[model samples]
Target: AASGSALIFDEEMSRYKLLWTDPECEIEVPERLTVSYEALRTHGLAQRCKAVPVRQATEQEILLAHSEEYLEAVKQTPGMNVEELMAFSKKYNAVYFHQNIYHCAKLAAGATLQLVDSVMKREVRNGMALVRPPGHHSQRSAANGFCVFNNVAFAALYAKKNYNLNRILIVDWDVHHGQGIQYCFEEDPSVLYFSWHRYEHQSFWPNLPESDYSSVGKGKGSGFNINLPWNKVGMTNSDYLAAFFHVLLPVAYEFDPELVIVSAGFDSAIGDPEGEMCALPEIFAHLTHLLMPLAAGKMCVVLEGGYNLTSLGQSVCQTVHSLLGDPTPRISGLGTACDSALESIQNVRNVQSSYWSSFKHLAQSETNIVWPEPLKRMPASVRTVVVPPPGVELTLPKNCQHSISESTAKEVQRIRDKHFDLTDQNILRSLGNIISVLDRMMRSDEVCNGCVVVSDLSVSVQCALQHALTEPAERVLVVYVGDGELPVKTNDGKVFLVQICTKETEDKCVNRLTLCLREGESLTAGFMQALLGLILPVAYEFNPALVLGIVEETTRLMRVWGHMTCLIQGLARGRMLTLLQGYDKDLLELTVSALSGASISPLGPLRAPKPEDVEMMEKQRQRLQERWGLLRCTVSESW
Candidate 1:
């Protein structure tokens, strides 16, 4: 398992050029990749990553999401002169090409796949491929928006077929709606595609009504397709975060995609002639950091759109900084969402309520049915109502001592007897103390997050499980990571369990799932997939009021610890608690701070899971598909 970010760049991709072009097409130049790559080198960031070579995508690979006829037509480009290429470009909207563009297009698609493969293989936790002939707007049978091949669309399809991934998240923030990728997976339930584009009520380029906030998706893909139409220009970091906090992040955490594909475009950055937005180059770092936790840091960024070379290069560096596991750079005044951005957020909420949970629970359900003229008019509804403050401080017991009470010990023993009990006195005492903390949490909201470091792993898990099941929460989601004897028991459906461990035992209950990775006895990309795609989606769909994580010392090294903690904080909105046995001082401090909503746990380097780990992961998802619907992949059955 390689444990770094992969940089896929090739000088050959620069061969594709716009022979003759309009203003829109002229900006889509080869300098985009070169400038971005050179920035990484100039900043000495390139040396920090594992450089992966780009290859030409095979005919069959290109056919994964492209039509054979389209592939054949592109193949003939190398034989054509400039006039012929220019004529061919007109058929595909804003696309242009040189004689070698056909080959460069294939390389661009293949480069994306190489990054995806490296991330999946654990050779690199995450990476970005800088390629020319930018993709995103390219369709299966036709090209659009200067895109020659739908690089991201084919990558999503390839991951589904080759890796058997059920849920792939395509976050296209390229300042234009990725209608190409959206159309390809519009009816497919497994892929969740999110794009925020300059749509001014469909007056923008690729001016289709579907690009508006109203088009959630078609059929099963309905709620999965998320579109944020920027009604006004000069959008900034605040506006972007508004959409994320109000829209994308909520559903994304719920969807729990096993992998994340960012259609990273810097045109959304400030000074980009095409984007015309005020967001800074460093905002890309914040965006990348937010998505890193999903799929266990298994994420890939492919160049999509960013005409401003200066900002493009800077934006690419920021994105790479995040993928390389750096702290997110701070941006100013992320305080309010502008009126137009707020309106768009509200409109999408109203339209997408039927598909997404956050909309129903947090947005629509709270509003009253007010009528204008006893019917309706342009109703001014509350938009961006649920905004969180900049900083967080979860109220933990201050300078308080935890001791096992005789009464609490009796309660612990009683609860254990009812289920499976642990007899370790030290652990029982810790359990008793934890119960007291939980009691305070339920009685008052003061206790934001709680952590109890224990010495006995098994006993600690038993105690955490018992406390979680009996709490005021309607449902509980328990996630156990590491190689250990699981705290096994029957489930009541309300208490669901997902165990990501090397060892396996007993048949799983409908509410209980054990993903065994004993063959490799190590964490891998497969575990990451299950964590983001299956475990997260299922847990969020269940809408657990509380999250219980039982972890071993070995699991602490996994960078996902920070990611999962932040994710649960967002999903539950400050309702998270974890019980780890024999915690170190630094680990204890980090966990407490993270749960309290102060900050996300800072991450270091990451290690990829082994090949055997991924294989075992697939087998587990397949075995549990009958019980967990979210675990079901497209590779299996039909509608």
Candidate 2:
């Protein structure tokens, strides 16, 4: 690794000596805001894991990790500068703070708790906090090391208590030792505390006396503290390589933690001035890559302290790549044999092998577990669903107009009210919507959009109902039934009708209006039924002017010669009706019956025309011309 990670796993074979981090403020974190954005915009993983600043965590969850005293101290702590934090803490409620520290700490604690919640709820595999002040050394009773609260410790406690996880592992690889962590969990085997720190007798700011490999815990906790002290100056990539092979790996592999947290600190770099070391940044990538899978992809590495810009830049990038499953970085500039590197490896192996003795594979297997190289696939979009349009009939909601009307509409409503959860308004409104569509289509004269009427009356309605046609607007059918001779022309000019009477009189033949419904059950029942039939012929005579359609079921049947013969007999009963309305019926009727329906059937012929038959026939023909041709022609001429 350009970082020290290769050193952590012994993946780097070169040997060099160095121990330093955090010079020229080399211990710094890459702006997480930008990095998180990169991860989001480029990868789309942001939507799944972006920090959602939503509702706060409940107090109960907060108290799971903090004692009431500690909680109260944090809450009630008052204003104090960096210079006064400890002195003020000793007096005022045993607490310390500055102006904004309390608010930041509360949310910070809540955020860590939020991350804990995520882990508990399995919302994410693992999460890292780049929060400050750093908590790896911050203790329970009072804050230290620029730290107010131990976020990691709080999170650890929360995880254990909430998820009931019995065994936990926290590995602090900060160049500075995690004294706070060791002091907090030193007695518990359930918490495995492993750390490596600056122990080369340099009088470091936070000198870790317990960082020595020989200082593993005293009694019940003896085997749990695995500390590998990397303390020589100028320990290059090779030095860390030796340390990892000899120390971090062997014990960590044996411990077999399901969850691994890295207290990632960038200060321990090759060029860092504080600790006097120069290791490439790529080592961090190698370290992260090695630990990721062994922890079952459950590794969470927090940014602790990285002070060099160039080194931090390179190292953080490398760590991110490793997280994305990239291969470890290549570290350069190292010989195979540095005294410090080799000695450190041997001491590490001794301590690690002595502590946990069950691994036969340790000697036989490759020191670094080989990660399967991540294979890149061509990017793709998956097809989700293809929905087809519903059938037209199904799309049309059920309408009541066809089956029910104003009178029966009430009964239908009552029935629906009993059977369905519909209000009358609901039924009416649904039907209205349907009618709205139908009304538009019908007005447009489209065959598909609406229902049209085809009626019982045909030709005769054309004449009597001809007046009905004058208006040019009506929304219904008025059909007539009679002999087929009459031609009714619709005002729209598209529909035509011919009326034929199927009605038989004393002659006993078919009658009009007997078809669809019988007697009391007639379609347009009662007075409407009788009027429905009578209106047809009268309608034809007047010749309705509107677009309301007229269809004659009787039109074609009346022209039958048998039916024609019966027409004379049929009408003779009614005042010996003349060939012409208001004609000289008294003088001619005796013989004029022959011409009543000249070609119609079942009427015995009147004997040959006396002066009466010829005269009457001629008179009838003249009547047809005068009324039909004269008046209509006169009107036409005027027009």
Candidate 3:
């Protein structure tokens, strides 16, 4: 609905800090906001965003999610002296107070509202508000976990009332659970709240029995509240990704809210004393990308608990990069989920199966890990390059490059001589175009992904594959979506191919897997299961240096195809080449948007996949799980 990303930051929110020292409250400092904002500016990400100013949320607005008595008590906070403030602070759990805290809290709540307003009004596609006194843990009657005002909780109510929106999704990625948000909407069916926190078996901070996996929600909201508790610390990137693939994502797609609000918290990231988890900051990039396809690109991210400034800043930038539609930094070392994580995931899935159809077919089945510092680099000025056939008029996204390079003419000549042995000008031109884009992507880190409109799908894919396979030690992943077998063959470990189509083929090999789905007019749960459960795991384990995708444009599943394009970009350092056979305007647009890092169109309310499709996917996973470890969802299975 909107074009750009909105960034909300008011320095006033950074004015108040811990007035006195309590060891638990000392980490809540003014520098958290400053460091995050400074990093965004230093990385040139701030200026790219549409700057939206924050205003103090009126008393009436604050009352939307808070109690009148609590509001009156907090209003007196600004006038209180140190003794009075300390006495006031002693009444709450792990919370502090200062003379300016009331004002800053108002600004914090107001800034979050500003982001919501901007997104709702279509001024920006999505945004993140950097605020302090993080809002998740604050309740209607009290403040806990260094939070106040329940900014996100208030924003959800405000959106529902103001926009006449039917459904709103709140995803809290904070390491600590937001009991306040849960309490606010636990009985209201309109708001779907999903949170994952470090539970440590009810020993973690603010450890409430309500924070367990079985606490599905209350009354009408039952089955809408999802709590994924991490039973232990030291969860890695794979653990987090596994939680999404097997738990949150499937349910979220089923819920399909009109607007998505992320309680963006970096405490769950690596090196955070609070989270004690090993997930790197770059994982935020993939998380953000996955969520972008929902809500028709209308998403608002508000900052919450992240104590370590270094980790907080990096994670903030990672989230902003994805909001800005940049190529996702490739994530590696993804393996099977740890025993504790698998247990938690299975428990939540089993408990909620009756509520969500995505989990109804569950054959109720159910990693310490370290990671290198994620590589960070700026994308090229041109994010996507598109090559269209002659006489075709197509509109490209901003900063997207168009057409072929003359330098690749000789390369196309060589390819023609080696393979085609014909002088078809259009075919040679298409080959040159594909090679040109591939060459630029190989030579430059800035050029992330591209698309080519080709005359002959098989021939075009073969040419592109041949070009990519020439570099020594460079492995390529080929994902083909069509009815027929891929023309090119790969025997070595250098190229891995996954073909998804209705037609089954007898051919099988160590490097190739064919996933068959019955012919369908629209995207189904089965296709998503295969994509997330099968293709994604294999792709990550393969860890290719580059990726090539070929799609038959006439296929009816354009929306899911767009999502597949978006999801696969998380591998290969965002280096990908897409070949489309024939052309439809809608398909081309979806392809361009996905390649340009724009959010793909939302696939709303997926139907339950046919049982046959599910069985086929399960069989494929069982067959391939031995070779690809990430495909294993449960810990009981051994190699």
Per TM-score, the best of the predicted structures is 3
| lDDT (CA) per prediction | 0.70, 0.41, 0.84
TM-score, candidate 1, is 0.62
Runs of candidate 1 with Cα error greater than 4 angstroms are: 362-561, 564-639
Give the better candidate number (2 or 3) by lDDT. Answer: 3
Worst 10 residues of 1 by lDDT: 378-387
TM-score for each of the candidates: 0.62, 0.47, 0.95
- Candidate 3 per-residue C-alpha lDDT over 1-639 given as tens digits, one digit per residue, 9 for 90 to 100: 478999999888888888777899888889999999999998999999999999899999999988899999999998999999999999999999899988988998999899999999988999999998799999989988888789999889889989998889999999999999999999988899999999999999888999999999999889989999999999998889888877887777778889999999899999888899989999999899888878878999999989888988889999999898877887767787788998898789888887986567674443003346556667776889988778887777776878655568777777777767577898888888887788778876667788888888878888888887774228899998887767767677888898887776765775777877776643466787778777887888788988998887554576587778888888887788888888777777888888787766777766687766776777776777767766766566546
Residues forming the 10-long window of minimal summed lDDT in candidate 3: 363-372
- lDDT tens digits, residues 423-508, model 1? 76655566676786666554454454466666767666766666666676666677777665566464566677777665666645
Q: Rank the candidates by TM-score, best first.
A: 3, 1, 2
Model 1, residue 318: displacement in angstroms?
0.4
Cand. 3 TM to true fold: 0.95
- Please state the error at residue 115 of candidate 1 in Å: 1.0
